[PDB]
Write a protein that binds this ligand. Structure first.
Ligand SMILES: [Cl-]
Ligand SMILES: [Cl-]
Ligand SMILES: [Cl-]
Ligand SMILES: [Cl-]
Ligand SMILES: [K+]
Ligand SMILES: [K+]
Ligand SMILES: [K+]
Length: 528
């Protein structure tokens, strides 16, 4: 009875509002819940922090409480929590995460600095619970150069944000101070952390030079061939432009990769409105890392989606489920330019135009006499899995504007999506289908009577059930994004988390969730 009503409350997603009745029920049993880590955030929610005596008692219980997971602590950094001791406790729990996990949350943690104390951040500038979020991140960045790289670029983009600057100067000034504190901590560090500062400086001037080059190509008119030759000439002039021969600097898009420079003679522009450049970076070890450099575009919505897809890919792998996804790197180097990792691939629309069908494509580049449908069993297994993975992930994220030009394919059988300009349920058309599945994908795996389609359906159920188990973490991260300058979030900041929460159907048992996902696929198929 009373015990059952608590377990329902405790198991709520982190963003659901407890009723008055629910809050006072949680309070009454506060002492009966101290060994349930998943109930601590529910308790903290129901505390009148206004009242000193109750706040005292609440902090006592926070001390005696079974410590909460790192994933749940992310909730305490959101805008709904202002008590300093609660926010310092969140940081203390975050300290238990290793750097691989921390890096996967970094984009959101940088947004959460909006919810920190701005005076503390400023006051740390030279003219257990002892660390706020800013001090924590700078401290972790000074020990890991990959963390430092992303901290720098994440904060630098929030600094240049002209909407924030005009519309919320206090928050813009905080991010300047965050960057000033970072620089200060780097200069006070040992030779290791001190050289990191100049590596960051070298990356920044390289991007400025690249930005300047893109503009130079576009100064006068010319056709694409003429513009490529301008691009190539300017890149090869290293005295002038200095982009083809640099001292092994980290690549911002992926700082583990050290770059000697851009290869001048293989750089070209894409045929599109913004004419982003395809650029091959020379690696310290003689290899090539292809990127797209975009100028005149805000990559931050793409950056968020690819960060989330990367996270979901890792969660699934943690569960021994590798769906062959393609979480390509995206890094905004400004609100107006950025990098994307280039993946060798071909749009499905071009597959249909040239080979007539996904199956024909596979039979041309990966045949197998005894393989399924004459296709390499290895390639077919890669295609079924990546279809299942992307069907579930784009459903959960409500990605829209899906067509055969932003569905991409590799000769190894990987299918993946690109261009996430429409998310969280926005779409150019009204009444879009909930499962982003089409007739070309289903024919690609042999149609709906095939063993592959069965496998695809099962991989969809598995993926959905696993990601459901991580709904708290995923909902928490999204709740740190509700004030970000990301267009599809800023449209309805107060409905964003709910939009993602609903997709998990946390109201269904696992048994029921699998039936639902089965009907989602069949109904989408029946409609195709
Ligand atoms: Cl009520
Ligand atoms: Cl009181
Ligand atoms: Cl590590
Ligand atoms: Cl704080
Ligand atoms: K990352
Ligand atoms: K660095
Ligand atoms: K990849």
């Amino acid at each position: 009875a009373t015990r059952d009503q608590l377990n329902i409350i405790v198991s709520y997603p982190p963003t659901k509002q407890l009723t008055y009745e629910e809050q006072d029920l949680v309070w009454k049993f506060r002492y009966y819940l101290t060994n349930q880590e998943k109930a601590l955030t529910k308790f903290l929610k129901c505390v009148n922090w206004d009242l000193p005596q109750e706040a005292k008692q609440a902090l006592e219980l926070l001390g005696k409480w079974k410590p909460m997971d790192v994933e749940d602590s992310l909730e305490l950094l959101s805008s709904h929590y202002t008590n300093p001791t609660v926010r310092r406790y969140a940081v203390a729990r975050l300290r238990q995460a290793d750097d691989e996990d921390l890096l996967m949350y970094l984009l959101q943690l940088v947004q959460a600095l909006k919810y920190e104390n701005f005076d503390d951040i400023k006051n740390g500038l030279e003219p257990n619970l002892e660390q706020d979020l800013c001090t924590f991140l700078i401290s972790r960045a000074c020990k890991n150069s990959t963390l430092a790289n992303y901290l720098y670029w994440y904060v630098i983009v929030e600094c240049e944000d002209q909407d924030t600057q005009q519309r919320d100067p206090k928050t813009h000034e905080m991010y300047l101070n965050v960057m000033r504190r970072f620089s200060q901590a780097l200069l006070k560090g040992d030779k290791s952390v001190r050289v990191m500062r100049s590596l960051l400086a070298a990356q920044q001037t390289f991007v400025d030079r690249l930005v300047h080059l893109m503009k130079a190509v576009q100064r006068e008119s010319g056709n694409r061939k003429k513009k490529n030759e301008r691009l190539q000439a300017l890149l090869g002039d290293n005295e002038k432009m200095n982009l083809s021969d640099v001292e092994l600097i980290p690549l911002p898009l992926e700082p583990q990769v050290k770059i000697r420079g851009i290869i001048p003679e293989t750089a070209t522009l894409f045929k599109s409105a913004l004419m982003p450049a395809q650029l091959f970076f020379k690696t310290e070890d003689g290899g090539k890392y292809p990127v797209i450099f975009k100028h005149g575009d805000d990559l931050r919505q793409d950056q968020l989606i690819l960060q989330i897809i990367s996270l979901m890919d890792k969660l699934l792998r943690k569960e021994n489920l590798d769906l062959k996804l393609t979480p390509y790197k995206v890094l905004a180097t400004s609100t107006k330019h950025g990098f994307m990792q280039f993946i060798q691939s071909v749009p499905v629309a071009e597959v249909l135009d040239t080979e007539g069908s996904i199956q024909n494509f596979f039979r041309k580049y990966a045949p197998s006499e005894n393989g399924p449908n004459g296709i390499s069993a290895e390639v077919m297994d890669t295609y079924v899995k990546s279809c299942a993975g992307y069907c579930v992930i784009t459903y959960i994220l409500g990605v829209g504007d899906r067509h055969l030009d932003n569905l991409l394919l590799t000769k190894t059988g990987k299918l993946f999506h690109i261009d996430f300009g429409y998310i969280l349920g926005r779409d150019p058309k009204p009444l879009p289908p909930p499962m982003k599945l089409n007739k070309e994908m289903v024919e690609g795996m042999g149609g709906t009577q095939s063993e592959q389609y069965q496998e695809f359906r099962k991989q969809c159920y598995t993926a959905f059930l696993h990601l459901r188990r991580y709904s708290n973490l995923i909902l928490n991260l999204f709740s740190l994004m509700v004030d970000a300058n990301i267009p599809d979030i800023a449209l309805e900041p107060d409905k964003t988390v709910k939009k993602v929460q609903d997709k998990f159907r946390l109201d269904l048992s696992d048994e029921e969730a699998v039936h639902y996902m089965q009907s989602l696929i069949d109904e989408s198929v029946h409609a195709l």
